[PDB]
Ligand binder design. Structure first.
Ligand SMILES: O=c1ccn([C@@H]2O[C@H](COP(=O)(O)OP(=O)(O)O)[C@@H](O)[C@H]2O)c(=O)[nH]1
Ligand SMILES: [Mn+2]
Length: 232
């Protein structure tokens, strides 16, 4: 079923920021069906205003998460002022995870001490929140990886290079049960200001009543610069 409960309604007590949840996506139908209402629930109990954007890559190039996140940033509503780059299959179970506006610096929700798998100090993946100003300060993510290498560690380099520091949950006592987990040297130049794309369609989707926006994105690839985008 699809009724909308009361606690999904916003009021003046939720405060002033609004989160764009940017979900890069390919063939994760099953996980999405759990994810959209899970997050609507989780965030709405925490009084976090949000909109969820499923970034659906429908060109026939290799899957380029980073490039998709750049598009999500660019296509998200101007009423959102921070983003959460958020894997579709990592669900937060702990109400103390801070998905609030990360004013001091990028906030890595899925820290290695909390992730069910990954465990190294500069692991930057899974769930990462930045203010739109900070994401712009970093020039967003590299578009050049096309699924190869570690686009996340390159992002960590952009964060430090921009003068920012990274913060992580403190005082969290659940462990590898904090989340439910459902189951390359390129040029440094470019990112948010060089991503090329178009949106083939936008679709309003409700999942048991919980809304999200599906963006069907066609990324362009300059095959002379990154021929390997075709290598799929
Ligand atoms: O073929 C893919 C690859 C990944 N993703 C998205 O990118 C995230 C991270 O990719 P994946 O979980 O496959 O790798 P991991 O982050 O666990 O190393 C996923 O949670 C999805 O949101 C996707 O939807 N389809
Ligand atoms: Mn995963």
């Amino acid at each position: 079923g699809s009724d909308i409960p009361e606690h999904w309604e916003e009021d003046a007590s939720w405060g002033p920021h609004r989160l764009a949840v940017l979900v890069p996506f390919r063939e994760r139908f099953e996980e999405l069906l759990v994810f959209v209402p899970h997050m609507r629930r989780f965030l709405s109990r925490k009084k976090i205003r949000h909109h969820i954007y499923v970034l659906n890559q429908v060109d026939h190039f290799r899957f380029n998460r980073a490039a998709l996140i750049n598009v999500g940033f660019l296509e998200s509503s101007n009423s959102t002022d921070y983003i959460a780059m958020h894997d579709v299959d990592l669900l937060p179970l702990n109400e103390e995870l801070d998905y609030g506006f990360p004013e001091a610096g990028p906030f890595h929700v899925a820290s290695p001490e909390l992730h069910p798998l990954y465990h190294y100090k500069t692991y930057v993946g899974g769930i990462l929140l930045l203010s739109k100003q900070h994401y712009r300060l970093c020039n967003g993510m590299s578009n050049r990886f096309w699924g190869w290498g570690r686009e996340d560690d390159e992002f960590y380099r952009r964060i430090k290079g921009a003068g920012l520091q990274l913060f992580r949950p403190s005082g969290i006592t659940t462990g590898y049960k904090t989340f439910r987990h459902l189951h390359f040297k390129v040029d440094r130049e470019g990112g948010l200001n060089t991503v090329k794309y178009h949106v083939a369609s936008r679709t309003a989707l409700s999942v048991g009543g919980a809304p999200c926006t599906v963006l069907n994105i066609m990324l362009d690839c300059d095959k002379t610069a990154t021929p390997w985008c075709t290598f799929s």
